[PDB]
PDB file of all heavy atoms in Angstrom:
ATOM      1  N   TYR I  68     162.546 201.758 262.037  1.00 16.85           N
ATOM      2  CA  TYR I  68     161.738 201.983 263.227  1.00 16.85           C
ATOM      3  C   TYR I  68     162.112 203.345 263.798  1.00 16.85           C
ATOM      4  O   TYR I  68     163.294 203.668 263.891  1.00 16.85           O
ATOM      5  CB  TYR I  68     162.032 200.913 264.267  1.00 16.85           C
ATOM      6  CG  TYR I  68     161.839 199.491 263.801  1.00 16.85           C
ATOM      7  CD1 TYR I  68     162.779 198.870 262.980  1.00 16.85           C
ATOM      8  CD2 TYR I  68     160.727 198.754 264.204  1.00 16.85           C
ATOM      9  CE1 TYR I  68     162.609 197.561 262.559  1.00 16.85           C
ATOM     10  CE2 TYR I  68     160.553 197.439 263.791  1.00 16.85           C
ATOM     11  CZ  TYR I  68     161.496 196.851 262.965  1.00 16.85           C
ATOM     12  OH  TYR I  68     161.349 195.544 262.545  1.00 16.85           O
ATOM     13  N   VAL I  69     161.119 204.147 264.162  1.00 14.40           N
ATOM     14  CA  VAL I  69     161.370 205.502 264.645  1.00 14.40           C
ATOM     15  C   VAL I  69     160.576 205.799 265.915  1.00 14.40           C
ATOM     16  O   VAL I  69     159.369 205.564 265.969  1.00 14.40           O
ATOM     17  CB  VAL I  69     161.003 206.544 263.557  1.00 14.40           C
ATOM     18  CG1 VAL I  69     161.004 207.962 264.111  1.00 14.40           C
ATOM     19  CG2 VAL I  69     161.947 206.428 262.365  1.00 14.40           C
ATOM     20  N   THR I  70     161.254 206.306 266.936  1.00 12.19           N
ATOM     21  CA  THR I  70     160.560 206.833 268.100  1.00 12.19           C
ATOM     22  C   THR I  70     160.029 208.235 267.803  1.00 12.19           C
ATOM     23  O   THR I  70     160.800 209.186 267.633  1.00 12.19           O
ATOM     24  CB  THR I  70     161.441 206.797 269.380  1.00 12.19           C
ATOM     25  OG1 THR I  70     162.766 207.270 269.082  1.00 12.19           O
ATOM     26  CG2 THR I  70     161.523 205.365 269.909  1.00 12.19           C
ATOM     27  N   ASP I  71     158.706 208.333 267.692  1.00 12.54           N
ATOM     28  CA  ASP I  71     158.036 209.601 267.388  1.00 12.54           C
ATOM     29  C   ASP I  71     157.738 210.274 268.714  1.00 12.54           C
ATOM     30  O   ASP I  71     156.613 210.220 269.222  1.00 12.54           O
ATOM     31  CB  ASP I  71     156.753 209.347 266.595  1.00 12.54           C
ATOM     32  CG  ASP I  71     156.143 210.628 266.048  1.00 12.54           C
ATOM     33  OD1 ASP I  71     156.816 211.678 266.117  1.00 12.54           O
ATOM     34  OD2 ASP I  71     154.999 210.575 265.535  1.00 12.54           O
ATOM     35  N   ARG I  72     158.769 210.898 269.278  1.00 11.94           N
ATOM     36  CA  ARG I  72     158.753 211.386 270.655  1.00 11.94           C
ATOM     37  C   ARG I  72     157.533 212.237 271.024  1.00 11.94           C
ATOM     38  O   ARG I  72     156.874 211.994 272.031  1.00 11.94           O
ATOM     39  CB  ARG I  72     160.026 212.186 270.926  1.00 11.94           C
ATOM     40  CG  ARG I  72     160.191 212.597 272.363  1.00 11.94           C
ATOM     41  CD  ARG I  72     161.221 213.724 272.514  1.00 11.94           C
ATOM     42  NE  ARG I  72     161.191 214.275 273.867  1.00 11.94           N
ATOM     43  CZ  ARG I  72     162.237 214.330 274.686  1.00 11.94           C
ATOM     44  NH1 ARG I  72     163.421 213.870 274.294  1.00 11.94           N
ATOM     45  NH2 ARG I  72     162.100 214.844 275.902  1.00 11.94           N
ATOM     46  N   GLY I  73     157.247 213.237 270.204  1.00 11.64           N
ATOM     47  CA  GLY I  73     156.188 214.181 270.510  1.00 11.64           C
ATOM     48  C   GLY I  73     154.790 213.610 270.372  1.00 11.64           C
ATOM     49  O   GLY I  73     153.816 214.242 270.780  1.00 11.64           O
ATOM     50  N   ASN I  74     154.688 212.407 269.813  1.00  6.00           N
ATOM     51  CA  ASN I  74     153.402 211.726 269.688  1.00  6.00           C
ATOM     52  C   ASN I  74     153.314 210.466 270.543  1.00  6.00           C
ATOM     53  O   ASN I  74     152.392 209.677 270.383  1.00  6.00           O
ATOM     54  CB  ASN I  74     153.139 211.368 268.233  1.00  6.00           C
ATOM     55  CG  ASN I  74     152.809 212.587 267.396  1.00  6.00           C
ATOM     56  OD1 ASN I  74     152.128 213.504 267.866  1.00  6.00           O
ATOM     57  ND2 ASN I  74     153.298 212.612 266.159  1.00  6.00           N
ATOM     58  N   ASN I  75     154.300 210.270 271.419  1.00  5.65           N
ATOM     59  CA  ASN I  75     154.280 209.152 272.353  1.00  5.65           C
ATOM     60  C   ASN I  75     154.042 207.807 271.668  1.00  5.65           C
ATOM     61  O   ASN I  75     153.231 207.002 272.131  1.00  5.65           O
ATOM     62  CB  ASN I  75     153.187 209.375 273.399  1.00  5.65           C
ATOM     63  CG  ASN I  75     153.506 210.512 274.353  1.00  5.65           C
ATOM     64  OD1 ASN I  75     154.647 210.949 274.460  1.00  5.65           O
ATOM     65  ND2 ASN I  75     152.483 210.992 275.061  1.00  5.65           N
ATOM     66  N   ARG I  76     154.719 207.572 270.552  1.00  3.45           N
ATOM     67  CA  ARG I  76     154.501 206.351 269.794  1.00  3.45           C
ATOM     68  C   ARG I  76     155.759 205.930 269.041  1.00  3.45           C
ATOM     69  O   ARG I  76     156.730 206.687 268.951  1.00  3.45           O
ATOM     70  CB  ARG I  76     153.355 206.549 268.802  1.00  3.45           C
ATOM     71  CG  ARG I  76     153.721 207.469 267.632  1.00  3.45           C
ATOM     72  CD  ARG I  76     152.534 207.768 266.729  1.00  3.45           C
ATOM     73  NE  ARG I  76     152.944 208.693 265.680  1.00  3.45           N
ATOM     74  CZ  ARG I  76     152.263 208.907 264.559  1.00  3.45           C
ATOM     75  NH1 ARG I  76     151.123 208.266 264.340  1.00  3.45           N
ATOM     76  NH2 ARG I  76     152.733 209.763 263.661  1.00  3.45           N
ATOM     77  N   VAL I  77     155.722 204.710 268.518  1.00  3.91           N
ATOM     78  CA  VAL I  77     156.798 204.170 267.699  1.00  3.91           C
ATOM     79  C   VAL I  77     156.193 203.738 266.378  1.00  3.91           C
ATOM     80  O   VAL I  77     155.192 203.009 266.345  1.00  3.91           O
ATOM     81  CB  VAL I  77     157.505 202.969 268.389  1.00  3.91           C
ATOM     82  CG1 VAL I  77     158.693 202.502 267.544  1.00  3.91           C
ATOM     83  CG2 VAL I  77     157.969 203.366 269.772  1.00  3.91           C
ATOM     84  N   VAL I  78     156.782 204.210 265.285  1.00  6.32           N
ATOM     85  CA  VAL I  78     156.287 203.890 263.959  1.00  6.32           C
ATOM     86  C   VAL I  78     157.328 203.114 263.182  1.00  6.32           C
ATOM     87  O   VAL I  78     158.525 203.215 263.461  1.00  6.32           O
ATOM     88  CB  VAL I  78     155.897 205.155 263.169  1.00  6.32           C
ATOM     89  CG1 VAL I  78     154.731 205.865 263.840  1.00  6.32           C
ATOM     90  CG2 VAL I  78     157.101 206.111 263.009  1.00  6.32           C
ATOM     91  N   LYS I  79     156.879 202.319 262.218  1.00  5.32           N
ATOM     92  CA  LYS I  79     157.826 201.665 261.332  1.00  5.32           C
ATOM     93  C   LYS I  79     157.386 201.728 259.881  1.00  5.32           C
ATOM     94  O   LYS I  79     156.211 201.952 259.576  1.00  5.32           O
ATOM     95  CB  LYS I  79     158.086 200.226 261.743  1.00  5.32           C
ATOM     96  CG  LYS I  79     156.909 199.302 261.508  1.00  5.32           C
ATOM     97  CD  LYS I  79     157.263 197.878 261.870  1.00  5.32           C
ATOM     98  CE  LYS I  79     156.073 196.959 261.629  1.00  5.32           C
ATOM     99  NZ  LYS I  79     156.362 195.550 262.015  1.00  5.32           N
TER     100      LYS I  79
END
Side-chain angles (χ1 to χ4, degrees):
Chain I
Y68 304 77
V69 169
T70 45
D71 190 10
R72 187 197 170 123
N74 288 323
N75 291 343
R76 71 186 177 163
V77 184
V78 296
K79 70 177 180 182

